[PDB]
Structure 1
Amino acid sequence: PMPPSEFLDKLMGKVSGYDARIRPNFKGPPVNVTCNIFINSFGSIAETTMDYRVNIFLRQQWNDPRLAYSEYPDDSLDLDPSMLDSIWKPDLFFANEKGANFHEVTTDNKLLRISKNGNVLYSIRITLVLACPMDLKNFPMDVQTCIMQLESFGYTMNDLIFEWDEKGAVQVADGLTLPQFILKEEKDLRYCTKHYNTGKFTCIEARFHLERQMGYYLIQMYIPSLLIVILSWVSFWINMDAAPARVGLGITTVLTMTTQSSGSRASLPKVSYVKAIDIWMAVCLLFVFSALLEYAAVNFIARQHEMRKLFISRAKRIDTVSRVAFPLVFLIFNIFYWITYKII
């Protein structure tokens, strides 16, 4: 028999009246395209830009009854990617593209095969830089949901309908891990049907849940800010007459916490609302700012001028309380802080 590249020329030629500009089942029911993706790579989730780069295999399946054959004996005909400009393909796009491209190295990374009953599989490799909004109300303790949605650009709902297939609509590669996040196994698959002044267009989307990793932000921000608070607590065990010792400790710790807070938001969007790392670096700034205000009460009362042995005993009393009080208030703040951002 004649080879499949020549048999498939007679199935697309001027004979038999095939036209690549006309959808299947024309002037009839709409075209039911069923889709699933395969995430090869994932990551580079920039939070200033609020986008993320992904690398997928987009598989599409529809039924073209004009491509049904019975003369050729075998069961599938792979169409060459040079000849893909000659059959009908759906005009899928991404409603949050922000730039995308094809992979064309050593061959156009495209694939198409046609069954005997006209079922057409069409798999392509796409790199996307998808946009997603970042809710950062509790920034190291959040679950970021970044989505991707697949619309039709030119065919309306009465012509072309997208669906996810019921057999694994999103697969993920095996060794796909992320440096800052983890990807939860449940993926929300729902509809996102759009309405414009043109018509109404089909849309399907898939949610991805990205829980962060606590372990990085503990090392850089939570633990060193917790040591500077303890570094202000050793002022109370220093003699009151050593005036540049207790002041010189209180000067430096209250201005390194300003440095630790200025570097806390170096790689973030400039959001207006206050986030959970900002309510840590402000309360921890409040303890080291009050550790120098304690000595301003010591140095004012102990300099009052028996009137001498009274106020020195009173300024001794404010130091015996503050050695017990300030680690007790910082301890009950950590109880109210970490429980609040674990219950949420």
Structure 2
Amino acid sequence: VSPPPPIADEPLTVNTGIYLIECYSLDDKAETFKVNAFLSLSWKDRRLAFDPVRSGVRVKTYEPEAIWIPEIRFVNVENARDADVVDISVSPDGTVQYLERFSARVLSPLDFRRYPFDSQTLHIYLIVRSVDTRNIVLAVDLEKVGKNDDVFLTGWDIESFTAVVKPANFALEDRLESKLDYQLRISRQYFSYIPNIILPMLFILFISWTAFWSTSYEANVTLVVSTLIAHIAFNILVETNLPKTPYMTYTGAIIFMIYLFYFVAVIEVTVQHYLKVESQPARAASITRASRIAFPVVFLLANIILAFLFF
């Protein structure tokens, strides 16, 4: 089977549509998400034309192997989509109406800069490579683009699923390629991060600052070192569920900055002890009294600066 011949010199327009049934496994480390959807294609193949008076049927149904079907592929998939043809219907004029249900792992880079208060635009790129005989161009039938009301992506809010109607027509290996951009806009549900990571991490930091109301070096060492170990645990936990970024993230900056506060607290606790041993507790008392105000103030200002830079 060869492609449909042109009436004049026009390219073959293949109208497309993606209808998402399910959205799952959005992997941050992998920068991949899974989709189970309907792919609908429509083109005119005048060779399939029939008279329903003779045929006895107003619409003809064909098996995929029986007729010519345009080779529509996905650009950013891991492996070739698992597809199952739902229906192929030809009307008397030769207008084929193809429908398949597919599942694919999609590659969509994520921007972790504002994590976990980030939003993402996922992409599903449809492509068609033109044949020798005639050029194939993609189109969007907006009536056949959508998503199920029950589509739930765990820990994410699905904002919109739209298509960039104008295809990206370009040359590749001396043949015309027509690309289409299906954009799924999502925003992260940041709720859980607050009682599970943020607040537990701030509590262990404030516990370390209780060493500013203690004269016991032994207990202060314990307070600041133990809480530093708990912060290393939170740092590990956070970085394990995230890919290695060549840029600084919001959570990354905060986690890092907090290490400096622990370092300076160790220095303060050390300075205080050296002075007490040197029989200068009045000077040690001045530094400790200052730290009590300085540490929360500098922490609060630094966080205002960071939130301002990122958001």
- Alignment partners' CA distance in 2, 1:194 and 1:97: 20
| Aligned residues of 1:67 and 1:114 also touching (Cα < 8 A) | yes
- Distance apart, 1:282 and its partner CA: 1.0
- Alignment partners' CA distance in 2, 1:276 and 1:135: 11
- Alignment partners' CA distance in 1, 2:219 and 2:119: 45
1:236 aligns with 2:218: no
- Alignment partners' CA distance in 1, 2:294 and 2:61: 78
* TM-score using structure 2 length: 0.90
- Alignment partners' CA distance in 2, 1:56 and 1:178: 14
- Distance apart, 1:91 and its partner CA: 1.0
- Alignment partners' CA distance in 1, 2:38 and 2:108: 20
- Distance apart, 1:327 and its partner CA: 1.4
- Distance apart, 1:34 and its partner CA: 0.6
Identify which of 199, 208, 223 aligns with 2:199. Answer: 223
Q: Which has the higher strand share?
A: 2
| Aligned residues of 1:35 and 1:163 also touching (Cα < 8 A) | yes
Structure 2: state its 5+ residue gaps. Answer: none
Amino acid at match of 1:225: M
| Aligned residues of 1:157 and 1:201 also touching (Cα < 8 A) | no
- Find the counterpart in structure 1 of residue 149 from structure 2: 174
- Alignment partners' CA distance in 2, 1:244 and 1:313: 20
**Number of paired residues?**
309
| Aligned residues of 1:155 and 1:201 also touching (Cα < 8 A) | no
1:41 aligns with 2:15: no
SS in structure 1 at match of 2:289: helix
Amino acid at match of 1:268: L
SS in structure 2 at match of 1:202: strand
- Alignment partners' CA distance in 2, 1:274 and 1:147: 24
- Alignment partners' CA distance in 2, 1:211 and 1:29: 42
- Distance apart, 1:43 and its partner CA: 2.0
- Alignment partners' CA distance in 1, 2:213 and 2:132: 76
- The verdict on how the C-alpha distance between 1:339 and 1:76 changes in structure 2, with shifts beyond 3 A counting, is farther
Percent identity, aligned pairs only, is 24
- Find the counterpart in structure 2 of residue 3 from structure 1: none
- The verdict on how the C-alpha distance between 1:84 and 1:109 changes in structure 2, with shifts beyond 3 A counting, is closer
Amino acid at match of 1:22: P
- Find the counterpart in structure 2 of residue 333 from structure 1: 302
- Alignment partners' CA distance in 2, 1:121 and 1:245: 76
Alignment of 1:96-135 (within 5 A): 96-102=76-82, 109-135=85-111
Identify which of 173, 177, 180 aligns with 1:204. Answer: 180
- The verdict on how the C-alpha distance between 1:76 and 1:212 changes in structure 2, with shifts beyond 3 A counting, is farther
| Aligned residues of 1:141 and 1:341 also touching (Cα < 8 A) | no
| Aligned residues of 1:34 and 1:60 also touching (Cα < 8 A) | yes
1:323 aligns with 2:275: no
- Find the counterpart in structure 1 of residue 263 from structure 2: 289
Amino acid at match of 1:79: T
| Aligned residues of 2:129 and 2:175 also touching (Cα < 8 A) | no
- Find the counterpart in structure 2 of residue 256 from structure 1: 230
- Distance apart, 1:35 and its partner CA: 0.7
1:303 aligns with 2:281: no
SS in structure 2 at match of 1:221: helix
- Distance apart, 1:137 and its partner CA: 2.6
| Aligned residues of 2:26 and 2:153 also touching (Cα < 8 A) | no
How big is the alpha-carbon RMSD for the aligned residues of Structure 1 and Structure 2? 2.3
- Alignment partners' CA distance in 2, 1:285 and 1:245: 20
- Distance apart, 1:188 and its partner CA: 4.8
Amino acid at match of 1:69: F
Which has the higher mean CA deviation after the structures are superposed, 315-324 or 330-339? 330-339
1:151 aligns with 2:131: no
1:314 aligns with 2:283: yes
- Distance apart, 1:339 and its partner CA: 3.8
- Distance apart, 1:246 and its partner CA: 1.5
Structure 1: state its 5+ residue gaps. Answer: 1-19, 306-310
